[PDB]
Short mmCIF file of C-alpha atoms and ligand atoms in Angstrom, two decimals:
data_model
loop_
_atom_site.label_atom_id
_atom_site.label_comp_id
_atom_site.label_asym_id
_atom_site.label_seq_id
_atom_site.Cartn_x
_atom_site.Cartn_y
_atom_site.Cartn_z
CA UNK A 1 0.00 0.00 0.00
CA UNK A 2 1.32 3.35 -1.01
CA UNK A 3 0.35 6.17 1.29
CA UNK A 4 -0.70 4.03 3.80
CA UNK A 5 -1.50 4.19 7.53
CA UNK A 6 -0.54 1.34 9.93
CA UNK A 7 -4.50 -0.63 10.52
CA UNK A 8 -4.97 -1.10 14.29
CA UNK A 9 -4.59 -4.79 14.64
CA UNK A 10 -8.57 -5.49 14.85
CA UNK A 11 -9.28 -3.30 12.25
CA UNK A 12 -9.19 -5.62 9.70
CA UNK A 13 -9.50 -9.21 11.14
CA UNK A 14 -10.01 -11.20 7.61
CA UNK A 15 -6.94 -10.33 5.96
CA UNK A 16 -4.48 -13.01 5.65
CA UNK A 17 -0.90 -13.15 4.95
CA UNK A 18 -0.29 -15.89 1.60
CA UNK A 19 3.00 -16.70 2.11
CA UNK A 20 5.28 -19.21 0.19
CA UNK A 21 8.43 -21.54 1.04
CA UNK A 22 12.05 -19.56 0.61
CA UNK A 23 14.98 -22.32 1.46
CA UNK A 24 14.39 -22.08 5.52
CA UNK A 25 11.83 -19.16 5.08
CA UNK A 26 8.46 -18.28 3.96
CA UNK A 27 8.17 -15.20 2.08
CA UNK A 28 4.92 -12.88 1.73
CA UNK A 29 3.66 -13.11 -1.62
CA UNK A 30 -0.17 -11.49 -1.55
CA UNK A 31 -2.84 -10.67 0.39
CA UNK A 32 -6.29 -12.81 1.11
CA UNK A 33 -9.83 -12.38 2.81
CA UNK A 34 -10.64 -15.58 5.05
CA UNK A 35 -13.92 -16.59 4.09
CA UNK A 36 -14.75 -19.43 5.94
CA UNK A 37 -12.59 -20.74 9.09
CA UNK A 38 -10.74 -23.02 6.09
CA UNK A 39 -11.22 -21.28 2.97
CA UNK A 40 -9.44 -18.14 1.74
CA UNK A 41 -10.95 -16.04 -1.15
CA UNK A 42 -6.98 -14.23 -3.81
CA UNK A 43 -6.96 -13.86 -6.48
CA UNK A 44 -5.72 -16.20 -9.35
CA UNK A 45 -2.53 -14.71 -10.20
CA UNK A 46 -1.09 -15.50 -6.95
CA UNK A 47 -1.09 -18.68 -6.58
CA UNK A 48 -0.62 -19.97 -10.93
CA UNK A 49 2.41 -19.89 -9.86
CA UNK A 50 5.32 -22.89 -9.23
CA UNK A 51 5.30 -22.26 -5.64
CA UNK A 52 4.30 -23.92 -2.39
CA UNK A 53 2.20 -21.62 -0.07
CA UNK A 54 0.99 -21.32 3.62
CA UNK A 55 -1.33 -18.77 5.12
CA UNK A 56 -1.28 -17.00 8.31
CA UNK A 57 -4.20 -15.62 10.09
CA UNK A 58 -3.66 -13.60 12.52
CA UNK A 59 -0.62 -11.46 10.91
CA UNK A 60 -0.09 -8.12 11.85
CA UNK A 61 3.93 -7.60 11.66
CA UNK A 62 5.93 -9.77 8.82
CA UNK A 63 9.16 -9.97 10.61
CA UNK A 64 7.85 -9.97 14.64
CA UNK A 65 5.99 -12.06 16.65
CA UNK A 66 2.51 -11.10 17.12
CA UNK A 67 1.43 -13.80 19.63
CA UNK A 68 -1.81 -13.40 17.20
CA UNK A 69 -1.13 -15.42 14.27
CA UNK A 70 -1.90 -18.69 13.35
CA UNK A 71 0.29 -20.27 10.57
CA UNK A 72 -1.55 -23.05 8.29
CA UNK A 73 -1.21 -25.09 4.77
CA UNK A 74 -2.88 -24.46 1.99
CA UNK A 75 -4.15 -28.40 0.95
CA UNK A 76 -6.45 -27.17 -2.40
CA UNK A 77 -6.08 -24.35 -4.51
CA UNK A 78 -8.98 -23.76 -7.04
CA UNK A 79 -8.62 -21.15 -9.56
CA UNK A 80 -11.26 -19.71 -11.66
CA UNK A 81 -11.76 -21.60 -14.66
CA UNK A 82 -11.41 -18.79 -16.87
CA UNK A 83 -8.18 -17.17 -15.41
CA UNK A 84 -5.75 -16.87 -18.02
CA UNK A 85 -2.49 -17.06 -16.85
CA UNK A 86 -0.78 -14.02 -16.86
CA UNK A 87 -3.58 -12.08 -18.05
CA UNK A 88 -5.03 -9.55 -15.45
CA UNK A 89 -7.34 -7.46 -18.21
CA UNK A 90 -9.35 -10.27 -19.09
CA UNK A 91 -10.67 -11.21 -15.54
CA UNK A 92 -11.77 -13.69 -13.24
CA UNK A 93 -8.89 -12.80 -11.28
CA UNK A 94 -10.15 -15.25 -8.29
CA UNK A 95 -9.06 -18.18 -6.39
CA UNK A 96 -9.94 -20.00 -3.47
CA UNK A 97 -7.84 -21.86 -0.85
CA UNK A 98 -8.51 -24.63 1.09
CA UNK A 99 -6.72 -24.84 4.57
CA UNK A 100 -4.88 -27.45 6.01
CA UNK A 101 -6.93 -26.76 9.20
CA UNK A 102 -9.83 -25.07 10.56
CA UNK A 103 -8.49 -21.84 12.25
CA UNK A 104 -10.42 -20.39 15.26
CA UNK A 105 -12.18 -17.32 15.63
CA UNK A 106 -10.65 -14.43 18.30
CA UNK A 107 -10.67 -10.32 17.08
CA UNK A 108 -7.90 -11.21 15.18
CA UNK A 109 -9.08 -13.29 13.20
CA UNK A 110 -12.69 -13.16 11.37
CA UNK A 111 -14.36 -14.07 8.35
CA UNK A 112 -14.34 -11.27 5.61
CA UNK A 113 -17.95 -10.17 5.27
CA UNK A 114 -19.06 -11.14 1.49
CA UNK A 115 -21.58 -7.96 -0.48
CA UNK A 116 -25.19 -9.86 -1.62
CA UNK A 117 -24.87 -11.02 -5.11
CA UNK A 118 -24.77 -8.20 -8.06
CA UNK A 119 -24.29 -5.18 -5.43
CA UNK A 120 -22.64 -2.63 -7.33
CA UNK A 121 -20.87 0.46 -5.13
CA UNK A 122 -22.51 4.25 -5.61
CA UNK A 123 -19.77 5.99 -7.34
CA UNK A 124 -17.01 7.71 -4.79
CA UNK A 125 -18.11 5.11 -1.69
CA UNK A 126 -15.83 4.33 1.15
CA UNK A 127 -13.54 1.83 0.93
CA UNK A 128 -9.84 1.09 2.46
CA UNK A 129 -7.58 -1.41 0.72
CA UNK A 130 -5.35 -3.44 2.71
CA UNK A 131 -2.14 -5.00 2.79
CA UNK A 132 1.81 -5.75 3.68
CA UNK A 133 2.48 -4.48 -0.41
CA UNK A 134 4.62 -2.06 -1.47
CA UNK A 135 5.01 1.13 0.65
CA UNK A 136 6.42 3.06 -2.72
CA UNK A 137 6.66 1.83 -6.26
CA UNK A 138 9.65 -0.53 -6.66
CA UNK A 139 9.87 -0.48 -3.04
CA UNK A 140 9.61 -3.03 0.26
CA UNK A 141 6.95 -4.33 1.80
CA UNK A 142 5.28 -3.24 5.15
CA UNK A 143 6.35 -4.74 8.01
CA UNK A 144 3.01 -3.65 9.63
CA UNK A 145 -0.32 -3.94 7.77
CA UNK A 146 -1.16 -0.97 6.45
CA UNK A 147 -4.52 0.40 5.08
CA UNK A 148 -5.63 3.48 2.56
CA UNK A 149 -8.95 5.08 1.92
CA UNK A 150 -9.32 4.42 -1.82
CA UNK A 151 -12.82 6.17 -2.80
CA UNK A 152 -14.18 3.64 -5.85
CA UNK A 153 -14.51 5.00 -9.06
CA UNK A 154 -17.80 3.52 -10.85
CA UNK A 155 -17.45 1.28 -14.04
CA UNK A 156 -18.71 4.44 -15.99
CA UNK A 157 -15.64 6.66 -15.52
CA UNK A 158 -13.03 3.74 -15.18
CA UNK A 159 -13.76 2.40 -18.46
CA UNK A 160 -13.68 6.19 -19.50
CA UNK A 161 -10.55 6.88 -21.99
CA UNK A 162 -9.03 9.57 -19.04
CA UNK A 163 -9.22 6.58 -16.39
CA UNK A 164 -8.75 2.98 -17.60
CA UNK A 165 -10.51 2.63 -20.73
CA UNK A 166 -11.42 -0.90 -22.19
CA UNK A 167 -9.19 -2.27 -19.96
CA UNK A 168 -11.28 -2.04 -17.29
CA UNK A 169 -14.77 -4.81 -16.89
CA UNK A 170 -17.56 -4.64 -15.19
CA UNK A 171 -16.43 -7.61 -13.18
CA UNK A 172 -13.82 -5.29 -11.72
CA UNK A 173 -13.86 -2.14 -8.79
CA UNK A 174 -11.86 0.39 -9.39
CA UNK A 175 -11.21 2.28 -6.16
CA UNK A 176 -8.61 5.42 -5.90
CA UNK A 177 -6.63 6.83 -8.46
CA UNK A 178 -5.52 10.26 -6.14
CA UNK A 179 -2.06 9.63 -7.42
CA UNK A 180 -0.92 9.20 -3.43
CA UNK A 181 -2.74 6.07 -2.46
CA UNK A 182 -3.18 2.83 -4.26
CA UNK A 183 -2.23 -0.72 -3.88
CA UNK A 184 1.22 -2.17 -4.80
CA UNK A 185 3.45 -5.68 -4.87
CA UNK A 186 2.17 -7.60 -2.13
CA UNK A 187 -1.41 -6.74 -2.06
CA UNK A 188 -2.64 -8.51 -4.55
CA UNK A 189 -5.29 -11.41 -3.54
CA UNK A 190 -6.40 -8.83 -0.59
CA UNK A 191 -9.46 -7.10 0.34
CA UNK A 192 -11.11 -4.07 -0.51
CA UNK A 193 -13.25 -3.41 2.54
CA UNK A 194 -15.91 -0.98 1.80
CA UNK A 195 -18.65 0.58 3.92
CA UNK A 196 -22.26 0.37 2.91
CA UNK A 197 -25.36 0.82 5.13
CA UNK A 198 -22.77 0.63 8.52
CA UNK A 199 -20.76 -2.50 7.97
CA UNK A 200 -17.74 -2.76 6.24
CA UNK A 201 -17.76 -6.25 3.63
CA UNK A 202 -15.05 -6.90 1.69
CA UNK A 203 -16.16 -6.09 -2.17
CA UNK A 204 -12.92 -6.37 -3.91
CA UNK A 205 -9.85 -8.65 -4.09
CA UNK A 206 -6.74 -6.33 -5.32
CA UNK A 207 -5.73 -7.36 -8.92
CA UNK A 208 -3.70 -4.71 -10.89
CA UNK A 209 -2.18 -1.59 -11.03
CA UNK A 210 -1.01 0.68 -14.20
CA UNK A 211 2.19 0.46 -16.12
CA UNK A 212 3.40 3.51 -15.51
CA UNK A 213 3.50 2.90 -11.18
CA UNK A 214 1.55 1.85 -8.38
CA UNK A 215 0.01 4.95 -7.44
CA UNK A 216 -0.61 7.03 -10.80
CA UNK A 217 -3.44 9.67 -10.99
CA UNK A 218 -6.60 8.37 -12.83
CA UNK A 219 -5.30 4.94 -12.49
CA UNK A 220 -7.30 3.53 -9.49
CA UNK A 221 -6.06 0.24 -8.65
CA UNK A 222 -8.44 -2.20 -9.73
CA UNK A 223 -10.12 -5.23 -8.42
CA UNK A 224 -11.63 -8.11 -8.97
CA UNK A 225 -15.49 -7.75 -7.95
CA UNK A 226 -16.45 -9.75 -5.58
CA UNK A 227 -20.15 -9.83 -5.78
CA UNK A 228 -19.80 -10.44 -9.39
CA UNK A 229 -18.55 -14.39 -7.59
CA UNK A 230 -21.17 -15.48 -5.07
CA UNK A 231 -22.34 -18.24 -6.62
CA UNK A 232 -18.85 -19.31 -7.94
CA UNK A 233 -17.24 -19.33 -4.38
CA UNK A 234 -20.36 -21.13 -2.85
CA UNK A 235 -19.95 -23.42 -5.79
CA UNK A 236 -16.29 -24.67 -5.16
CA UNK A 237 -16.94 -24.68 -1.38
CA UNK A 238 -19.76 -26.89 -1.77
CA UNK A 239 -18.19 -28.99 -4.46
CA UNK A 240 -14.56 -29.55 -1.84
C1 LIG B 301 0.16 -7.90 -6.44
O1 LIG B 301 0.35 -7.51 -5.20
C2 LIG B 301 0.19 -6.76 -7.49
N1 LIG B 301 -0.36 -7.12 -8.77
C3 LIG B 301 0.38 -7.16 -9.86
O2 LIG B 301 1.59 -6.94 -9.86
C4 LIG B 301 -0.33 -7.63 -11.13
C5 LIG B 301 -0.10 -9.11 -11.41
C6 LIG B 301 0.32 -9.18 -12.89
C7 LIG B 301 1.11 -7.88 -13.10
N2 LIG B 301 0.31 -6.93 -12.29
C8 LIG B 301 0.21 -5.61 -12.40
O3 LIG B 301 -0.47 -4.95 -11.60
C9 LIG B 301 0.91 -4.90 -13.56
N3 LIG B 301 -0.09 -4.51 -14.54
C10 LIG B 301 -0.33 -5.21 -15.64
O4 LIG B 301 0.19 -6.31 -15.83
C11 LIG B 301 -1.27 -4.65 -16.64
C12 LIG B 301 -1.59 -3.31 -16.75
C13 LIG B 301 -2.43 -2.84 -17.72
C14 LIG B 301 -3.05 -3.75 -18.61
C15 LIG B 301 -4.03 -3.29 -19.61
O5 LIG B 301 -4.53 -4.09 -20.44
O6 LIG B 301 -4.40 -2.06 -19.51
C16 LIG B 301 -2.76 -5.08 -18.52
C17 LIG B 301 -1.86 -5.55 -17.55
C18 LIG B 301 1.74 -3.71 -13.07
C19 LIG B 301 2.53 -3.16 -14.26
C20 LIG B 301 2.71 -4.14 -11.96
C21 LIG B 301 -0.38 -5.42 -6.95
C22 LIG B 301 0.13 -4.27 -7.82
C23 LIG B 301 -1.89 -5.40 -6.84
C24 LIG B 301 1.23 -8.96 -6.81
F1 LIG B 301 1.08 -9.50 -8.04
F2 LIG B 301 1.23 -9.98 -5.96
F3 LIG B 301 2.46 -8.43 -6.78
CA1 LIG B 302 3.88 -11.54 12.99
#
């Protein structure tokens, strides 16, 4: 997250840390929402990847101790079907992962809170992305998780030429584009948590950013929609 503020550590009790295996180490990779107590919603692009993951719940500070987290293996990984490697633009940027174990419950860790099917955001709403990412383009990652207040920007002016153009589907939220605050390398798979009628649910999952940097004016950082997936993710978890 560029321009970021450290999150309490109950802020934000659904993201996860998707780590993967470095020699002796695990390494942060992207972000996640925990959806169930073993199923985490990322996206796609994280995890088509020759890699071996974990998750940890419970994360607040990469390289500390929390006493918080628990640390857990990632058994299934089902992508999309139409994810195309490589291939953010098209879509369906959206995977769900099976955990080793059932984690329990505490203010640290929660499940993400899912918009109905087909909700669409007003134009401008409140959201905050999420995430250990990139503090500056080709930077480091957080140590602590940070959050930013990314207002969305409806399908209707992202798709405009000035913001995002074609490249941008309605199975996508864009949120930001200030030039200050945006996602960045390491956020990806996490939520966008946006406020609607008092509670904050978790309508994105953080896909891609512009060419040109992380945080670029008129280049929101864009998501994949969650509520565009309801019946997909109920789907798989039903079906595993
Ligand atoms: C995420 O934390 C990370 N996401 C990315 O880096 C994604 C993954 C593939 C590369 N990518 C990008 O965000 C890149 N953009 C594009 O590849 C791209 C831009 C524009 C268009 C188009 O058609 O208009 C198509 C593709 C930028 C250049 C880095 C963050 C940034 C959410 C992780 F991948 F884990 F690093
Ligand atoms: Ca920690």
């Amino acid at each position: 997250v560029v321009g970021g503020t450290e999150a309490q550590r109950n802020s934000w009790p659904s993201q996860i840390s998707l780590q993967y295996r470095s020699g002796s180490s695990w390494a942060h990779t992207c972000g996640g929402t925990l959806i169930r107590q073993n199923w985490v919603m990322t996206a796609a692009h994280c995890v088509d990847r020759e890699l071996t993951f974990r998750v940890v719940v419970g994360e607040h500070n990469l390289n500390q101790n929390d006493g918080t987290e628990q640390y857990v293996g990632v058994q299934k990984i089902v992508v999309h079907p139409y994810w195309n490697t490589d291939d953010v633009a098209a879509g369906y940027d959206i995977a769900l992962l099976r955990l080793a174990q059932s984690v329990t419950l505490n203010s640290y860790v929660q499940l993400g809170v899912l918009p109905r099917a087909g909700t669409i955001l007003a134009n401008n709403s409140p959201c905050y992305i999420t995430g250990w990412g990139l503090t500056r383009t080709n930077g480091q990652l957080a140590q602590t998780l940070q959050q930013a207040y990314l207002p969305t920007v409806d399908y209707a002016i992202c798709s405009s030429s000035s913001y995002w153009g074609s490249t941008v589907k309605n199975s996508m939220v864009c949120a930001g584009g200030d030039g200050v605050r945006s996602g960045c390398q390491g956020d990806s798979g996490g939520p966008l948590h946006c406020l609607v009628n008092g509670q904050y649910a978790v309508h994105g999952v953080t896909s891609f950013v512009s060419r040109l940097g992380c945080n670029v004016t008129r280049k929101p950082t864009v998501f994949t929609r969650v509520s565009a997936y309801i019946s997909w993710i109920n789907n798989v978890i039903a079906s595993n």
